[PDB]
Scaffold this active site. Structure first.
Site, mmCIF file in Angstrom:
data_model
loop_
_atom_site.group_PDB
_atom_site.id
_atom_site.type_symbol
_atom_site.label_atom_id
_atom_site.label_comp_id
_atom_site.label_asym_id
_atom_site.label_seq_id
_atom_site.Cartn_x
_atom_site.Cartn_y
_atom_site.Cartn_z
ATOM 1 N N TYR A 145 5.800 -16.199 11.113
ATOM 2 C CA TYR A 145 7.115 -15.905 10.537
ATOM 3 C C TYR A 145 7.347 -14.425 10.327
ATOM 4 C CZ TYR A 145 8.513 -20.784 9.927
ATOM 5 O OH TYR A 145 8.869 -22.106 10.149
ATOM 6 N N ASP B 82 24.017 -23.186 9.124
ATOM 7 C CA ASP B 82 23.284 -23.347 10.379
ATOM 8 C C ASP B 82 24.327 -23.624 11.458
ATOM 9 O OD1 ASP B 82 21.757 -24.115 12.599
ATOM 10 O OD2 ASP B 82 20.301 -25.201 11.342
ATOM 11 N N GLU C 245 11.649 -27.847 -2.408
ATOM 12 C CA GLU C 245 13.081 -28.144 -2.455
ATOM 13 C C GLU C 245 13.339 -29.373 -3.335
ATOM 14 O OE1 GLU C 245 15.653 -29.753 1.022
ATOM 15 O OE2 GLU C 245 16.074 -27.607 0.824
ATOM 16 N N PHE D 237 9.103 -14.540 2.025
ATOM 17 C CA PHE D 237 7.737 -14.800 2.482
ATOM 18 C C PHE D 237 7.692 -14.804 3.996
ATOM 19 C CE2 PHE D 237 5.526 -15.973 -1.497
ATOM 20 C CZ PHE D 237 6.635 -15.906 -2.344
ATOM 21 N N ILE E 190 4.742 -15.469 6.589
ATOM 22 C CA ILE E 190 3.351 -15.878 6.735
ATOM 23 C C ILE E 190 3.112 -16.300 8.179
ATOM 24 C CG2 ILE E 190 1.593 -17.539 5.865
ATOM 25 C CD1 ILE E 190 2.584 -15.543 3.702
HETATM 26 O O1 LIG Z 1 4.122 -20.654 8.434
HETATM 27 C C1 LIG Z 1 4.994 -20.424 7.592
HETATM 28 C C2 LIG Z 1 5.716 -21.454 6.986
HETATM 29 C C3 LIG Z 1 6.695 -21.157 6.032
HETATM 30 N N1 LIG Z 1 6.957 -19.811 5.687
HETATM 31 C C4 LIG Z 1 7.977 -19.428 4.674
HETATM 32 O O2 LIG Z 1 8.549 -20.620 4.082
HETATM 33 C C5 LIG Z 1 9.964 -20.610 4.373
HETATM 34 C C6 LIG Z 1 10.421 -22.068 4.466
HETATM 35 O O3 LIG Z 1 9.895 -22.672 5.576
HETATM 36 P P1 LIG Z 1 10.840 -22.955 6.852
HETATM 37 O O4 LIG Z 1 11.827 -21.833 6.993
HETATM 38 O O5 LIG Z 1 9.963 -23.321 7.978
HETATM 39 O O6 LIG Z 1 11.598 -24.274 6.363
HETATM 40 P P2 LIG Z 1 12.856 -24.927 7.119
HETATM 41 O O7 LIG Z 1 13.985 -23.846 7.087
HETATM 42 O O8 LIG Z 1 12.526 -25.137 8.690
HETATM 43 O O9 LIG Z 1 13.297 -26.151 6.410
HETATM 44 C C7 LIG Z 1 10.098 -19.737 5.625
HETATM 45 O O10 LIG Z 1 11.417 -19.175 5.664
HETATM 46 C C8 LIG Z 1 9.128 -18.635 5.319
HETATM 47 O O11 LIG Z 1 9.729 -17.742 4.364
HETATM 48 C C9 LIG Z 1 6.219 -18.790 6.307
HETATM 49 O O12 LIG Z 1 6.430 -17.618 6.031
HETATM 50 N N2 LIG Z 1 5.245 -19.101 7.250
#
Ligand SMILES: O=c1ccn([C@@H]2O[C@H](COP(=O)(O)OP(=O)(O)O)[C@@H](O)[C@H]2O)c(=O)[nH]1
Ligand SMILES: [Mn+2]
Length: 281
Positions: A65, A262, A239, A60, A62
């Site tokens: 991103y 990470d 999650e 995804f 969005i």
């Molecule tokens: O504005 C957004 C927020 C979330 N995501 C999708 O949701 C995933 C999970 O969110 P994020 O990576 O921010 O979570 P984190 O890794 O910081 O815990 C991202 O990899 C994207 O694939 C996106 O595409 N646009």
């Protein structure tokens, strides 16, 4: 039906010597935990190529991103399922912002337009399940669902494929279950008590057969709808639900943190012989 493997020459596995003595390589329900040194990729490649396996990868992208897609896709081309048929599914609100990435033979990409970051992250469960249900069943054998803010740095291949897998969250693989950030409020469908839990799986990398992935995503979507109706939002969103599901439906393989790392936050511990798929700061 599965035809015979061809003659192959490789080192004999030795019963009285473990591949890895420093880590757990099988769960108590007899699911492999996938670490470097535990698999012969030539044998696995043969097994899966002989089935003409197609792997779908969902991602995804969005709003902001979309910026992550170029590196994500280019590195996937170098490291993800090379040699096998791959179908990328890029879900986005900006089809025109999807970079034109050059793909190897037998690999294709579809751009699927979709409509709070918490909701963006969570809603992945609905789109994977009840909207793309029929398409996946017709197009791929396995589905792999990952975050986009990532890059591949090393091999991620058919060693992960299985009816259902989760990935050990890199911040918790050495933690006691009481320290896992499960949803702890009994009012949520994601609730897990302090005396339960095998592992803390990361929402950023799960997968399996299309059937099992659609079961998992359907279940998490339904559970999230119940929570919404009850005015509660799980602490770590989908999650948390993924963790509840994989507690009650044991995965058939578990990926080690090689598969979701990470380096900025956690460095490069001796236990990790490879960093395969890593966060982009
Ligand atoms: O504005 C957004 C927020 C979330 N995501 C999708 O949701 C995933 C999970 O969110 P994020 O990576 O921010 O979570 P984190 O890794 O910081 O815990 C991202 O990899 C994207 O694939 C996106 O595409 N646009
Ligand atoms: Mn992420």
């Amino acid at each position: 039906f599965m035809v015979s493997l061809p003659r192959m020459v490789y080192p004999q596995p030795k019963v009285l010597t473990p591949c890895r003595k420093d880590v757990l390589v099988v769960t108590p329900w007899l699911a492999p935990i996938v670490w470097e040194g535990t698999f012969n990729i030539d044998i696995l490649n043969e097994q899966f190529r002989l089935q003409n396996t197609t792997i779908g990868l969902t991602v995804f992208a969005i709003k902001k991103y979309v910026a992550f897609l170029k590196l994500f896709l280019e590195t996937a081309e170098k490291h993800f399922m090379v040699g096998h048929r791959v179908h990328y599914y890029v879900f986005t609100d900006q089809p025109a912002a999807v970079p034109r990435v050059t793909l190897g033979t037998g690999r294709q990409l579809s751009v699927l337009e979709v409509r709070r970051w918490q909701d963006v992250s969570m809603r992945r469960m609905e789109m994977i399940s009840d909207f793309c249900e029929r398409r996946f069943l017709s197009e791929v054998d396995y589905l792999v669902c990952v975050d986009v803010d990532m890059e591949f740095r090393d091999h991620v291949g058919v060693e992960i494929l299985t009816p259902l897998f989760g990935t050990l969250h890199p911040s918790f693989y050495g933690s006691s279950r009481e320290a896992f950030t499960y949803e702890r409020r009994p009012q949520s469908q994601a609730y897990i008590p302090k005396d339960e839990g095998d592992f803390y799986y990361m929402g950023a990398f799960f997968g399996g057969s299309v059937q099992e992935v659609q079961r998992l995503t359907r279940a998490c979507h339904q559970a999230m709808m119940v929570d919404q109706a009850n005015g509660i939002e799980a602490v770590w969103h989908d999650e948390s639900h993924l963790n509840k599901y994989l507690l009650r439906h044991k995965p058939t393989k578990v990926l080690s943190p090689e598969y979701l790392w990470d380096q900025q936050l956690l460095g490069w511990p001796a236990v990790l012989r490879k960093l395969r798929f890593t966060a982009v700061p």
